[PDB]
Amino acid sequence: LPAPSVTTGIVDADIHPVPQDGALEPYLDDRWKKHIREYGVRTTTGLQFISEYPQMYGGAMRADAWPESGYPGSDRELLRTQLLDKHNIQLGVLQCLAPGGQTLNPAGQALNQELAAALCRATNDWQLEHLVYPDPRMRAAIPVTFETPDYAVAEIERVGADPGVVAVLGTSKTLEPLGSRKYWPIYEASVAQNLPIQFHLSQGGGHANTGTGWTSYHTEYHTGHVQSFQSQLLSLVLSGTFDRFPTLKVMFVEGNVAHFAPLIQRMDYTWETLRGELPDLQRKPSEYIRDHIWASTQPIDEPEKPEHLAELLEEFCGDNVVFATDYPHFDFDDPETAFPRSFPVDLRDKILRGNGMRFFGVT
Amino acid sequence: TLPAPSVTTGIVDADIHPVPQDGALEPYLDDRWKKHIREYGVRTTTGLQFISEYPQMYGGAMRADAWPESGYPGSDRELLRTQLLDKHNIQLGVLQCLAPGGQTLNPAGQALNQELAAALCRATNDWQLEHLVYPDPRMRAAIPVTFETPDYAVAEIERVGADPGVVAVLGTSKTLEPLGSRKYWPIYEASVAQNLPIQFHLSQGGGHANTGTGWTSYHTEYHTGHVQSFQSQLLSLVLSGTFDRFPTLKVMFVEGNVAHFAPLIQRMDYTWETLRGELPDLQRKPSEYIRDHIWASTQPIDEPEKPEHLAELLEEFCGDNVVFATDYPHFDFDDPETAFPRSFPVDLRDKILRGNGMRFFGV
Amino acid sequence: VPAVVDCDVHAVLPSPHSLIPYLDEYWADQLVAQLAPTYEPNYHPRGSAIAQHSDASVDENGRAATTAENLVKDVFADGFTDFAVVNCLYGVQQIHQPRREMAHARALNHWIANEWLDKDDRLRASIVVPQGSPRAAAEEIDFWSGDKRFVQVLLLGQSELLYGREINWPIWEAAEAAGLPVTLHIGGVFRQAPTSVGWPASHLEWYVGQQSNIEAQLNSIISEGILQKFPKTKILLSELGFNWLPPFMWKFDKLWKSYRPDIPWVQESPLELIREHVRVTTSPSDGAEEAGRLDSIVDRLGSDRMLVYSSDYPHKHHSGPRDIENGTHSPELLDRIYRRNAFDLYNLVV
Amino acid sequence: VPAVVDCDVHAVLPSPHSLIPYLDEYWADQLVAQLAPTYEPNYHPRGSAIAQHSDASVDENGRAATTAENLVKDVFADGFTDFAVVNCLYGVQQIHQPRREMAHARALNHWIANEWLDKDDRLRASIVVPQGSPRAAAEEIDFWSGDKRFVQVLLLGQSELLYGREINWPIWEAAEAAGLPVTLHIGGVFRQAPTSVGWPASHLEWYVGQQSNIEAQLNSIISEGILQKFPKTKILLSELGFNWLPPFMWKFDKLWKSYRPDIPWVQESPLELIREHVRVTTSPSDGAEEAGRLDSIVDRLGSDRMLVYSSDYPHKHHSGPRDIENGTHSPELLDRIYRRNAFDLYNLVV
Ligand SMILES: [Fe+3]
Ligand SMILES: [Fe+3]
Ligand SMILES: [Fe+3]
Ligand SMILES: [Fe+3]
Ligand SMILES: [Fe+3]
Ligand SMILES: [Fe+3]
Ligand SMILES: [Mg+2]
């Protein structure tokens, strides 16, 4: 399969396909089809079928993205006409959120981690055969079990060299922060395969959805997702993880962008006084951003003053900002309308093209 | 050179708590860690600089009679020789060092900085062999390792674990994931390679609340509640199939009481009869694992209202897998001369004092 | 004569739509536009062995206990039982949105009242409360306290904060003012890991190990002073086992003696307190159904007053609701478990 | 003329023995029999570079800010400051025993009253409250509402449950009743992981990351309707930065426009709500002291009313108390920061 190529089209780093009902079973051991029939997919909830914050309005989906049967993002043809053709996307990164039907929770977050790995492998054989290979404008970010690094490595070693795989997919929430040594075997296998890592928006993880209690209302819930990415950025950087894997690239998918810029700026300011606690950190904390930390744009930050968007993105790092549609979720972003009318064209072109090509290794 | 431990007339004591005198560890610590601890202390899962989340109540929960002229109880090697090792004819007293300083419960292995923690453990193991075991080989060490960083734990088992001064690996009752999780398997593996059983001692911390439904308020809650961690760990160690993977692994639950295990296992068996189909990889009935894999020390002895029930409940657990301990020098110290109820059968008391501990430590 | 009360049987919510006739239009509209996510708990996975015995009547989807006629058919078929205490475990307590939790618990109780209590006068029920908001919980118990068919307050075994926390005092106060025992039933709000050492990887492990949480709860309720501040409290432990109680009781008691000044208001031994205020249902029996074992565990509890009969209908457990008779040679004791211990709770006469 | 108020300085408790004059015979005796364990917290570890300035006045053990004498000499040495709001962070909130928590908090405020506020009328202070029990927390506010030398309520950045949950409304009610602002200060009760993704392994990573929790607390306070139930409420964010606010305001604002019918008591934008009700201390400035960047963050905030001056004595930050003047070219903005904005909170004059 040919290496991806981006010329006059664009990069979309966050697309959510769902398998049709029963679509993963060709790739499932009989033990796990049986387990799911009798047990479902237990996770860090007390709930049989839904996550602990179920989606508020119509499943958080675009009203116009529902195929003639099934869930949105479950129609292969609808995804190529309505998203890939419609916007000339020449690199679309699939981020399979769920096996669909039974559950929308991420496959890697099943409490049974052998089942988790089963579901991740099934998602990976599926998306590669059912979308990537029939339409290689699509490439897969492969979901793996970050909470069992053994199994994550096995799966990166199995698929990770595939030309239809562009990234490794974990979640924004985890049992321990992402710079912890627990996850280093995964970073090592990723690096070994020359694969960047994408962490997407998620519930679960094992701890509450904020560092100080579970949220009540939907604004708290949905705004609250940025907090997890703020904690993971600081962990990943301040752990020295990027001293250990100096070629590792990490992208934060759907955690917004602008908040990272005063996070980093607070990280450096504090570090100026307290760096002695961390005498082996080889660089100033913000010096890791350009080589290691990227962010998807959706949902676009909407400052009260439109000119603050460009400013804040530059303060994060203007090279490390990558367009994403989040097709087909409700707060979907369109490449023509997402950026404010005063937005510098040069920033905008490279958010659409050059920045994703770099992060994903397209040259 | 030390002779292999020998138990004849004397008795096994599975829980002795020495503490290093102030500065006793410094000839074994890098200066880096010496300076780190001077500034930051030994940071763990509290917002407290010096004390754990539940500081002990009356007299520091230490025996009012075991204090030396200056220093904390258990820091005077001569006092420990006369007051414990001589006074009760202990021929194998297993050291469980749970502090670097002059406190009751501040485990090195639970420092959030896991390089500091591995260093603190390495120092405790050099100290205790040098200062206690080799000068009086009636003591042998349970070596604290960092259970939450397997790589460092294994390296320490490899470094010092074959020393004849060492008879077990030392962990805590409280962990970030249940002890049957795959995270810990690399430690079980290196321990089986060093022919070492594992001891898990009562602890705070671990990363969750001290119950599975909220933090406790009063000391009756805190102290009785320690039992609940051990119940949760037994179930995980059994049902995960850890002992299917490690057929020769032996673990002892230290200071988590004994009786309560028996109805627990009775409940586990009863439930498994119905629900066993969720765990089809398990090779044995869950209660069958007890006899070969799960031991328990006795302090603080259970005290039923009708004292014939103790022996009844110890047998229902496993009469062969209960091991004596004093918990010198804590306040609820058990005197072997008085701990056992009057109707207690001598066969059971004597294998508790000798043969069961001898078989768990391979003496 | 005190009546044979099955102290724990289950009503299962068919789907969230069954709630619509009992919710305001704001919540009724809001439910349909969310596409009606179901808060069906995972405590008894609907496709697993424990969900229902093969003899239980089922519905069009193969589920048991979704209608009163199916439950009543099964529970009373043989004439042994006089009353049955119906607990609905639908996961309203896992609704994080506190107003929706109040509204959905309100609609659930209304549902029990109209589609169960009104349909067979042999049925009683627990009050489901929005335990994320303890003063809404207190108000909910008060609302239903006038309907005497509602005979206890339901709380889950695992709560957000321990039930003896002063934050939770309103619930114990409302239940007492209503003359209602409180039951803790297996289940949880899962707002932390369900054990002190993290998340159990299987349902089997979770279900076995919830007993550890009930020890936490009992020690909290008692130590915090619930039984002195609300001294008419009655605690029923529903479907949590019971063989674990004696060892816990002995350790709580010995440690009470150690820590007297810490809890000066607790002046009676926790053994006497637990024997007076705590009752336990017998399904599952967790092995006490075996020869001599019921006599044994009652000897270890030190009270014949604590166990109350239940079938846990429609759930499947290793031994049956009447198999407890194999573990005792004493008809007196069986008379206590079958009728007279539950009279302390509900005063139901046949 | 509104006074130059230093809105965040610290008194550091020498040991728990300093509370014995202010404890009842029961608690004093118990504290000594416990070998007086210290709840000195780890938010500013005593030997780390943030604890105190090299040239701070110190005591016989080399610790800064353990006597009003030492603190006064330093903070007021140069005549610039008119008043200093003292915050004692001694960790009574991490005392799990609820009645010891109440006793030691009240004792700490006595120590602040008798050994700080009585030694210099330029000192004001926050009320330390036992936030493990919001009713007893409410009552500690009430207990000090009559000493207007106490000018605000101290709450930790990380709590047990979010501050907008009904469980915590007694704290907000009692503060509005007292006319007292509520301040969140950096620190926590540590009854869960301090991030939604687990335990930060360094103090550095913990200190930086706690901004995220304030986002959570602000949304909780606003989403649950604290600002409509208690519409005189004023919140001070003490020592938590502020440069993070605008990106948070913008997303809260965006999503409120989507989710208003879920929280319909919120008819004003969270942008405007935050601008009017939330203030923030300037130490640390987290880089807004850099050229032009104070003008920038003010613009991003959409208000020059929010920032209030503090030195965070005796903590050493990367930039100093008045280096904030290098971030702006506006003497009028510096007038608001130095005196006028804090008049909103304390109404103190020269
Ligand atoms: Fe997305
Ligand atoms: Fe999305
Ligand atoms: Fe011990
Ligand atoms: Fe002990
Ligand atoms: Fe039940
Ligand atoms: Fe401060
Ligand atoms: Mg098998």
Numbering used by the authors:
A (entry chain F): 12 to 374
B (entry chain B): 11 to 373
C (entry chain A), D (entry chain E): 29 to 378
Could you give the paper's own sentences about this structure?
The expression of AibH1H2 in rich medium (lysogeny broth) furnished samples (LBAibH1H2) that contained ∼1.7 equiv of Fe and ∼1 equiv of Mn per AibH1H2 heterodimer (entry 2). The incorporation of tightly bound manganese ions was evident upon inspection of the electron paramagnetic resonance (EPR) spectra of exhaustively dialyzed samples. Unlike the case for FeAibH1H2, enzymatic assays employing LBAibH1H2 yielded substantial quantities of d-MeSer (33 equiv/AibH1H2). Since the protein structures of these two samples were found to be identical (RMSD = 0.34 Å over all atoms), our findings suggested an apparent requirement for one or more Mn ions in AibH1H2. For example, while our most active preparations have Mn in Site 0, other preparations, specifically LBAibH1H2, possess only 1 Mn ion and ∼2 Fe ions but are still competent for turnover. Although the precise location of the metals was not determined for this protein preparation, our biochemical data suggest that either (a) one of the Fe ions must occupy Site 0 or (b) there is a mixture of metalated and mismetalated protein if Mn must occupy Site 0 and Site 2. If the former is true, it would suggest that the metal identity of Site 0 is not specific and AibH1 may accept the most abundant metal available in the cellular environment.
